[PDB]
């Protein structure tokens, strides 16, 4: 695999009886994987692009990376190593990832600050790592938006943002918290919209993005008087349209070369000179 | 859009996860279709390429095209008309094509001179024979220059009929008015030649065995039996299969080349 | 089962709605099995044929047999016996065979000299056993070639050499090694070709075999400046056409009589004499 | 190629791994076909074998063939022609064959003398009856000499109609102008006779029960009811099934008998 | 279940899209089951019929029953009880039955005297039990024959004796042994025939039974010079036609009432008197 | 063979191991068929039973039969003939039967007097109405006397049309020339009545609700809407289904009643 | 879930290619569940309706509830807790319920007094709990009857009482016992009928209920001279028509909201004012 700009997606043309199309990146699983691996930024595909209308992606990434990776180790300490299959899942809001390691299931929650039953943050190192991941989420979303807006593709009509929802959700949940209980801001209308309508198709998004409507007054009222989430027994998301949507668990896989052979060094022959009449 | 005469396109299919591979061109059905349509060369994809180590493809094509098309009309005259579903078949040797017209089956045989008297006809025939040789050579030249990971899984089976005609004709105009060409003869004999091995082994291959030339004179390239058998170049007698040519068009699509782009850096996400 | 000449194949006509055709020998699985069994040559089907344009098959076989069998024992010593289902597999190049014994998987690699991670040969007894198996491989290939060339069959058109690849691969890999680091020779063009094109159909092989083209100069250059194998993470094979092909794992089974009854001793009756009019 | 009159061929089928077994000849469909085709005996596979403990098979065959074929023509006269798909059926007793002509169904009954006046007709009938007896006897003689592991799974069911006709006829020309033959009668009664047990038990089997001969006179070999019932030899009344005869040709093949052989010892592999 | 005569079968009409037909008795499984259960004769369905052209069935049965049952106990002693699903199988010749008891497989061989690898009889009690079971086999066969001959059924044409083979086989195997090595007799042609042709259909059997052909001289020669069985690695049976047939393993099940309700006590009403016009 | 008018036969089907149960008679299709065939009563299975608490079934049947058959002929006159596949359907109320003739669909309506002028016609109609009442009563009487374990799974649904006609007619000849019969009315209203509960509850059931008689006068037994709706007896308005009647014959069989028996005690087995 | 009257059912319209219809309540599983949970009446949906032509439902329920729940605990004491999937079954007569708790099967029988092999009641507390559950059964049946009679539904024609059988069966079994061996009464004809014909469809029931026939004399005779149950090896039920019916095991499940989202707070917009022409 080679250079890719942070947030960018690749669309692959599939052919079956029709032409389907995997969105596979959605560079999302790759991203999480990097984070858990603790890998440094300059060790990732994202290395050395324009950068940026994304101020200091590298640092925030590196922080978020160390934090996430530490979290991993701290989850796996009390448990065996014995020397893992790659698919993730993200219950939300906490954005708890859920790997599985060739038998044993592992579960770790970044942004636990977005929990009720948990809270008890309380380390400032932790708080710093969390704000870093939230930051890199916003930069991912923005990578994707910027790249969409500049790279129309015939499949846009069949594609939506569903698989980005968790990041967005976290991004707004966090924005709410650090907003209610510290600097004043209201949650960001763009992320809020993309989070509310995850069915936004690519083309219509590119067209309608700029700008979209500001949060309805009534919805801000309901946002204060109650929360962005109704916790019920599973969690519900509110607005921006006043809808209450169950937050799905999303699963991230990826695949690769898988056995790929090489025809490019193969001697080429000139067939004209041969006289067949 | 533009395609060079004889060239093939390989399409990657995906089904489990496997990846199968249609050879669909094999630009063959397209070619026949053009011919029946009577279409002029400059009206075809093949228009305006290097051209050539293929001297005067355009003329011979145009001739062969008018000839074929005339044949069609002369087959359909005594019969009803239409305002037709596209698949062909080629019994061989005569290289009789067999379309079907949304009910009614039609059947017309180019190169009827081959087994089973106008000089205009002779001219059209020698033209189609020519364009066959040029198609084969297009394909050969393009293979030799365009290696593809799937070559290992691909063979020449679907080219057999043209090759067969090309040699059958060569034999006729040879016996009563040269020996048949060893390359075409080989590709005609071994239709299972896989692409890669072909590119590698093509140059050159062995000359026709003496014994096989003897048997080629003392008897023919074809044993007609009741269905037809082909002989050599290895001394094999192979039944000549009926081959079927279809094509499809991924449902006719749109272009995004013209869609408004937006600069998304400007807006405030933090 | 009865007499068969070394390298020879048998083709069986199958009937299903069409007539398919098993190549089942491919006497290959049988061969390996013999080798692991340590069986002596005069105890095998191959016993007592013309023999030969294959000088001293018997000795080299017997050596290769003792060597292989010893290898087996040495693999199974540190492990249980407790008193096996017959199918093999051959990752290559090392030509490591992989049996399974009614529960427990066993894995043993002849020609380990064809390994990087292994090397450390180092016994000359071993070296002798290895050169013996490589020898019997070349004699198997040649058995098959000679027998093909003399025994045309209507199915030749549908048959290829795919299942012989591993032996050939080993045969050339070895030829390379003992070539680079001892007597001068270049790897043998025939084996090299059959190894490169495993899709060679029987008929075209018989016809085209004699002779085929000598290794391209450029390919010999690339063969020195780099190797016959690109090791990547699985192994890639090079040329003779400049192709880089992934080496498949191949599986060898065989079946037999399975319940077969006997009609040949059954009393025969003469029905003409009876007068029915 | 060559086959002796009455002989069967057993083909080993493979499906799971099981091995099933088509009896396909049962050279019966082939036989009927010949007859309708009017083909002469020396033009058939049966040509030039030992022949015979079957005195003058050729003549009787040729007669029965001309007769049958004439019957066909006389059925198809009043009806349209063609330039036909091959499967037959035989309601019995009359042994009416039932072909189908690529649309139109045709139906013609040999041995119409059997239930449901030309002496030429009588002659043709007695000829087909004869060749039936010779077919059965071909089959019997060949079974008895050619044991096959599948005999245990095979029976005579598909021979029933000929046998039935053979006895029905025997009865007629017997009552009004001998008692019906116990062998044919037995094989006709028990169509489930497996090959092996048949070879073993054939010689001889029991003579018709007296009581059954009484019931055979006082009533007939057939109870016609509304479809027809057969009687004895055991006192059973069995509905006579319609039987269907098809055949196929493993797709017409090639020969390698003539392909150049190479001496491969010569070359250097080490 | 109620009264049934020893050897008798019942045919059941099945309906599916056609009418199939189970032969289910074949009272064979029931019989074995009785024997293993050790049940006394007067405790079985067979109790109190004409009896007989079968002299002293009751005693021989009772003996064979005690013997079989003892055998069972002696097989199960060294093993657990812990307090069984009903299906049997009969490898032959030994006529070893093979139950399974809700987990654990059990295997017991009556007529072990019909073994090579076993032999070592040697108790006369055993010999007595064995000759008893062989006797009751002959009486079963004869029950079935007699009952067939008197009870024609439209399905006879579709039915054969396949499922009786093992008893017959044992019956002749035994007859051979006690014949070669004690009183002179040749094996019984009827049992021998039914054993050779297990495909004998019911109707043709009834018709052809009386009598059938005597053993071919050549077959008696081959029967002395070699045996009724070729043991090969599974066993082969010989003649009476000179055929060598693999002896199949046969499986005996049965089913019953399974939930059956009762309409026969249900009050019946007279509907004419009611005036509907 | 012999069956009493109105009687049903239950057949045990076996599929998993379950045991399903065809009610196939429901001798209804058979009955209709007879009627169209015009067959005389003494030519039918129903011939020669106790008969009766059903006064003069034979006459009324014969009348209804001639009438129906005449109707058939009068429907088929203006149309082509044949030398027909057997399934019927009955839209209701008119009780129009709908056969199909191996291509051509035919449709004929007995009791046309019912919704949608010859006295011969009136007579035939009143005859079919009569035989319907006698069929229902046959079935009732036979149920009440013949309990079967499957009664619990069986209902009267397939009788509905006759019952419906029987009441519709009763209403007509009642309004313009008695109140409709409560039993038939009930069975017509609840077609889901299972056999067992029917036998138990039949005697007697409740008399028509007053309110329902009021609604029966002030409006009708049928709301015709665009398909027809039935009313009461419970105040339900039920769409009247089209019902389809088929029958099959386990492939026509043989008898063993006559097959020679052998005394097998005699022979020596030991 | 919200208010429901004791015994009432709800019918749900299903759509598949047709419209099927679940009877799911049948509030029966819910009821049992409550009882095992030991829940008090005022804590159940049934709370605060008309109540009643059902005198003192609340008390009898509460008693029956405590009794059942105690029974549960007493079944689970000798066994593990370790901290359950909701489906029940009811063999009858005893009306033994059969839960399963995420691995381990549990089985508890209310109305054990309706057993032979058990009997040995003998506590009067128990007797009191039992008569309470029997009472609440009769009140459930009557809830359902009353509610049916007043709430016609187009599906009535396709619905029967099959799933109520066990309660009814218990209700009559009990009535018999406490009848034979204490106050004189004959078993109640209505329950007896509904118990005998479980195929009674809803509509015909509503119509025919009032009244139905009194128990046939002959059936009362057979009811004394033998019992309501023939115990056979599974149990058979008798009459009221003289039928002997096997009593089925019945299984009670229920499902719910399962992920349900909320559109009702979602901002509504007025589209007329916008001028599109």
From TrEMBL, chains A, C, E, G:
It comes from the Viruses. InterPro entries: Reo_P9. This is P9-1 protein.
């Amino acid at each position: 695999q080679e250079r890719r700009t942070f947030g960018s997606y690749k669309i692959e043309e599939l052919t079956i009886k029709t032409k389907k199309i995997p969105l596979l990146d959605d560079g999302i699983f790759e991203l999480l994987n990097y984070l858990i691996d603790g890998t440094n930024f300059d060790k990732t595909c994202y290395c050395g692009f324009n950068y940026s209308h994304l101020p200091n992606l590298e640092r925030d990434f590196n922080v978020a990376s160390i934090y996430v990776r530490e979290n991993f180790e701290l989850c796996t300490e009390n448990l065996d190593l014995k020397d893992e299959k790659e698919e993730n899942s993200k219950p939300v809001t906490p954005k708890v990832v859920t790997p599985k390691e060739e038998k044993k299931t592992v579960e770790m929650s970044l942004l636990p600050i977005l929990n009720r039953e948990s809270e008890e943050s309380l380390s400032s190192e932790i708080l710093e790592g969390e704000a870093a991941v939230v930051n890199v989420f916003k930069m991912y979303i923005k990578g994707f938006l910027m790249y969409l807006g500049e790279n129309p593709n015939s499949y846009d009509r069949q594609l939506n943002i569903e698989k980005y929802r968790p990041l967005l959700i976290s991004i707004i949940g966090y924005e709410h918290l650090i907003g209610t209980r510290v600097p004043n801001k209201e949650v960001n209308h763009i992320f809020y919209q993309l989070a509310t309508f995850d069915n936004y198709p690519f083309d219509l998004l590119r067209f309608q993005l700029s700008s979209l409507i500001s949060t309805p007054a009534l919805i801000r009222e309901k946002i204060a008087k109650e929360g962005l989430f109704k916790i019920i027994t599973t969690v519900l998301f509110r607005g921006i349209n006043g809808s209450e949507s169950f937050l799905n668990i999303k699963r991230y896989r990826k695949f690769k070369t898988r056995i790929v052979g090489n025809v490019d060094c193969v001697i080429k022959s000139d067939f004209s000179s041969l006289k067949l009449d």
